Amino acid sequence: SKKEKKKGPEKTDEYLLARFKGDGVKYKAKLIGID
């Protein structure tokens, strides 16, 4: 098994801001309730 664990980090909460500068806005807008 020892071999490149899950792709990149397994972060997901504090990591939001990590990806925020990428595909965060795409769903952020929608997950909110825009159009």
Strand content: under 5%
How many separate domains make up the residues? 1
**Rounded radius of gyration (Å):** 14 Å
Number of strands: 0
SSE order, as H and E? Answer: H
Helix content: 40-55%
Subcellular location: Cytoplasm; Cytoplasmic vesicle, Clathrin-coated vesicle membrane; Membrane, Clathrin-coated pit
Protein name: Disabled homolog 2
Organism: Homo sapiens (Human)
PDB class: blood clotting
Write the layout of secondary structure elements.
Blueprint: H1 16-32
Features:
mainly alpha, platelet aggregation inhibitor, 35 residues, blood clotting, monomer, elongated, sulfatides, 1 helix
Textual characterization of the structure:
It is classed as blood clotting. This protein has 1 helix and no strands. About 0% of the residues are buried. It is about 50% helix and about 0% strand. The radius of gyration is 14 Å and the shape is elongated.
